Amino acid sequence: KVFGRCELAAAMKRHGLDNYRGYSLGNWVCAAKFESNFNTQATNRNTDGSTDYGILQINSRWWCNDGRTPGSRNLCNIPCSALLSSDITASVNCAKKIVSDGNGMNAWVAWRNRCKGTDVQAWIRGCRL
């Protein structure tokens, strides 16, 4: 499923990501934009053998168990296929654990490169919410 910008903004806002651990809603919408282009089915296979899943491109090496990654820890305690659903609930709950660490949203590389430091409230612009 491919989300609209405002449509995803409402869903993320509903799941309590606005200002969660100090990161405003505009950050989360912008992160999902460059990470997966608002596409819940996006998966990018890494060279090391791990895979990134879903709208937030969560890596299987630490966070989820896809069954094909050697030495994985499954910190979110979920199967990686749950991050590919059209309901972002599993992605949001896993993401809340990730951002709680000392690295914050720097765990998402595309967010660090493109969204971090810019005017992120542009993404929630024109959205009812």
Residues acting as catalytic residues: 35, 52
Mode of pairing for the β-strands spanning 51-53 and 58-59 = antiparallel
Q: What is the 3-state secondary structure (H, E, C) of 12-75?
A: HHHCCCCCECCECHHHHHHHHHHHHCCECCCEEECCCCCEEECCCCEECCCCCECCCCCCCCCC
Tell me: is residue 119 an annotated ligand-binding position: no
* Nearest residue to 29 via CA among 96, 120, 129, 93: 120
As a whole number of Å, the CA-based R_g of the chain is 14
Distance (Å, whole) CA 7 – CA 114: 21
Distance (Å, whole) CA 51 – CA 8: 23
List, in order of start, the domains of the chain with CATH numbers.
1-129 (1.10.530.10)
Cross-strand bridge partners of residue 65: 79
Resolution, angstroms, 1 dp: 2.2
Distance (Å, whole) CA 71 – CA 20: 30
